[PDB]
Design a protein around this ligand. Structure first.
Ligand SMILES: CC(C)(COP(=O)(O)OP(=O)(O)OC[C@H]1O[C@@H](n2cnc3c(N)ncnc32)[C@H](O)[C@@H]1OP(=O)(O)O)[C@@H](O)C(=O)NCCC(=O)NCCS
Ligand SMILES: CC(C)(COP(=O)(O)OP(=O)(O)OC[C@H]1O[C@@H](n2cnc3c(N)ncnc32)[C@H](O)[C@@H]1OP(=O)(O)O)[C@@H](O)C(=O)NCCC(=O)NCCS
Ligand SMILES: CC(C)(COP(=O)(O)OP(=O)(O)OC[C@H]1O[C@@H](n2cnc3c(N)ncnc32)[C@H](O)[C@@H]1OP(=O)(O)O)[C@@H](O)C(=O)NCCC(=O)NCCS
Ligand SMILES: Cc1cn([C@H]2C[C@H](O)[C@@H](COP(=O)(O)OP(=O)(O)O[C@H]3O[C@H](C)[C@@H](O)[C@H](N)[C@H]3O)O2)c(=O)[nH]c1=O
Ligand SMILES: Cc1cn([C@H]2C[C@H](O)[C@@H](COP(=O)(O)OP(=O)(O)O[C@H]3O[C@H](C)[C@@H](O)[C@H](N)[C@H]3O)O2)c(=O)[nH]c1=O
Ligand SMILES: Cc1cn([C@H]2C[C@H](O)[C@@H](COP(=O)(O)OP(=O)(O)O[C@H]3O[C@H](C)[C@@H](O)[C@H](N)[C@H]3O)O2)c(=O)[nH]c1=O
Lengths: 260, 260, 260
């Protein structure tokens, strides 16, 4: 292995082979770090998490195959997270308690995944993505940058279950899916769109449109929305909300003029 | 610290500083008790729970700040519960497995929180409150006495997400929210009201009224409800159900005549 | 006790009395095996699971009563599962992470229960049953063979909560309940029926019928359904899908001609 003299490893931690722990990594009590795991500098790994979780092939003969897991810098991984092999997570990742992340998945930077959330295999999550408590992300889902998935949201993939050909849901830039909503297979949720709480999304959602209900129905453009406390127009949200965003220290316009 | 000679502490338990464990406390295998935690007499702490969980300030320099957690007497805390600092829990608390409770929260007495439930920060829960499996309780929610939140219920707080001004849901005395229901931000659910299973509650619910659907719509007064097996009028429920209630040994009327 | 010389027991495992571990059982790091547990040959028990979990009677005087838990052969139990006493699980069981299973429950063979799923007490689950992520199975539910319960599905049991007489939901052979659906108490979901995603099922569902919505309404026979990618008729699904089924190596007809 390769563990930095500056890394902090608490009691109970169990470590396998081909593991690399960078400078200033703090690995809390009882974590289990299986083989082929690489933790980047300054990350914090929560108590009892288990990284490099066994893929199915393992169970064939109980011999662990190489399926490397990498986790970027300054991660803030909370307790008991379970993270599979063949997956990559970028920098400044942050999680809640008891989150599960499967294999063959890609998570960008400045992403957050709340308590109990379950990310399946072969999922793609971009940067500055916010996934709250107990969200279900099924295999083949595509979540672009700045997307927000609120508590208990569920993204499915089998259109006539159980079947052999799955279709991933794709959520475009800045879209917001409110709490307890479920999106049916292969659906496309367009940029800056808003899915109202509890909805059952059965058809694509066009850009900047608000849908609500079961089945979800279009009700208006997001620009119609006024802040309930201040009465100001809320969306596009990038212009009215910037906590934890790359433009926090400035304004979206100036920031995107630079980025582009 | 301060640990009672009569407390039982199993193997694997890890204890920090400024921890007080009262008489007849049984702390099961592998619990992690971080700093500033006070457990009151006769409580039972489930295997691997982690009490005094780190607040965000901790992560700044990995130096633990004082954020005292107190847990009342005769608690029956099941396995792997995670409980944050700056929170207070009363007597006779009971939980299911893998429950999470955040900071700056207050839980009364004779409260129950089922398996997977997630209580956010700055939440208020009164006495004799029943929260079942996997309920989501967002910051700023107010749950008064004798409220029942059934499995997978979700209480939200951001009315036009993502935004800066949140509005907590307030649930009044004896109200019942059936399974898989979601309540929108700032909504007021009145006393003895009944929210039918799976509903999407978008407007306040008046006292003793039954709402159902997405969006939830009023259908009748709870007094219209007849027990499906016995045909008797069910609500107000205090008069027809008393298991685990303070009037179990008597009748509601006699009991409330005394209490008041 | 009785532990086979061929069993593999990792570090941290804690074992009680009256425990029997058969040949080729692999018990991963830190599992807690309480009293009266019997694990059948070749099973794999995930890290930190806790088997023989305490029943309520335990808490009376913190003296563990005999409530035997049995787990059939070649189980693939993933991490942190919690399994109660007085329950029986058949062969080839498979689970996801952090699943909870209560007492007085019966699970058949070739059953799968995904991540976060919560099976309550006194539940009956047959063979070749598929329960996905975070499904809630309340006491008194009856799930027959070949049933599929997709993510976040919830089966309830108290028809006018809170009340004293519960009514279990019964799901017949091959039925499919899509994601985020909730079924009300005592409902009967008939064979080969299909409950569409997110539905609120309030009335029995007849055989081979598709219901959708809140409240769920019948829309057509499942035979009307065409595969979204291939355009072929999907149901009955036994004829179009056989991954992990007893007819995988043949065809349903030939297979059932033999079985019967
Ligand atoms: C989309 C949203 C912001 C509502 O916009 P809105 O302007 O408040 O809609 P209004 O209440 O002013 O009026 C909307 C009408 O559609 C209905 N409606 C509003 N939201 C609905 C929903 N989620 N589902 C179904 N119907 C809804 C209202 O009841 C009203 O119906 P009506 O014709 O009977 O009067 C809201 O539904 C929502 O989902 N907010 C997000 C809550 C959340 O999950 N936050 C994240 C968790 S913290
Ligand atoms: C409120 C409740 C008790 C129903 O009252 P009810 O008297 O049985 O209503 P009924 O079925 O007799 O008749 C109600 C009508 O409204 C509909 N309806 C009933 N419950 C509904 C619901 N939750 N959502 C939407 N529609 C509903 C019925 O289908 C029927 O509609 P119809 O006009 O097509 O006939 C029930 O909906 C409920 O939520 N029970 C709680 C289940 C639960 O979660 N227990 C806790 C978990 S164990
Ligand atoms: C039942 C199901 C397969 C849909 O059948 P369908 O043939 O695609 O229905 P269609 O979309 O072709 O047309 C159906 C009509 O009913 C509506 N509808 C379809 N599914 C609906 C649902 N779950 N709830 C409410 N309405 C629905 C459609 O929007 C359309 O309504 P319309 O009159 O406004 O056009 C689908 O609803 C479903 O639940 N699939 C399972 C998704 C899933 O959970 N997989 C498991 C998780 S991976
Ligand atoms: C900071 C923190 C977070 N978490 C987990 C809890 C939750 O599942 C997830 C998000 O917690 P959060 O960071 O407190 O929530 P966030 O600030 O992103 O969202 C909040 O603000 C947005 C704008 C509102 O719409 C939302 N409804 C609010 O919760 O992370 C924890 O468990 N502990 C923590 O200390
Ligand atoms: C007693 C007990 C409880 N729990 C957890 C499981 C669940 O998430 C929560 C409530 O379990 P419960 O006490 O068995 O359920 P309760 O008796 O409160 O509710 C029951 O009765 C009411 C009246 C019905 O409406 C309800 N649908 C029934 O479940 O506590 C456990 O995990 N293990 C236990 O041994
Ligand atoms: C194989 C495997 C499974 N699981 C858990 C994750 C999930 O909660 C449960 C099912 O995982 P799965 O076996 O990958 O899902 P399954 O193949 O049964 O279902 C899939 O195919 C069916 C036909 C689709 O309708 C469905 N939407 C797909 O997920 O088991 C894990 O956690 N890790 C694993 O390696």
């Amino acid at each position: 292995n390769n563990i930095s003299k500056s890394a902090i490893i608490k009691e109970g931690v169990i470590i396998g082979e081909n593991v690399t722990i960078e400078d200033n990594v703090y690995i809390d009590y009882g974590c289990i770090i299986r083989d082929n795991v690489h933790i980047k500098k300054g990350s914090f790994i929560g108590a009892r998490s288990i990284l490099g979780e066994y893929l199915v092939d393992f169970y064939n003969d109980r011999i662990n195959k190489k399926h490397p897991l990498i986790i970027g810098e300054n991660a803030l991984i909370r307790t008991e997270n379970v993270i599979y092999g063949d997956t990559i997570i970028g920098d400044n990742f942050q999680t809640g308690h008891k989150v599960t992340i499967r294999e063959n998945t890609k998570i960008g930077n400045n992403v957050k995944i709340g308590t109990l959330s379950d990310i399946q295999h072969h999922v793609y999550i971009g940067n500055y993505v916010n996934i709250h408590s107990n969200v279900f992300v099924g295999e083949k889902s595509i979540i672009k940058d700045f997307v927000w998935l609120f508590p208990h949201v569920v993204l499915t993939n089998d259109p006539t279950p159980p079947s052999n050909e799955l279709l991933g849901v794709t959520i475009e830039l800045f879209a917001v899916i409110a709490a307890r909503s479920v999106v049916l297979p292969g659906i496309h949720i367009n940029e800056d769109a808003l899915v109202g709480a509890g909805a059952v999304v059965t058809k694509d959602v066009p850009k900047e449109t608000v849908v609500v209900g079961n089945p979800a129905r279009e009700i208006c453009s997001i620009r119609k929305i006024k802040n309930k406390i201040t009465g100001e127009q809320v969306y596009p949200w990038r212009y009215t909300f910037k906590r934890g965003m790359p433009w926090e220290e400035t304004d979206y316009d100036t920031w995107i003029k630079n980025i582009s």
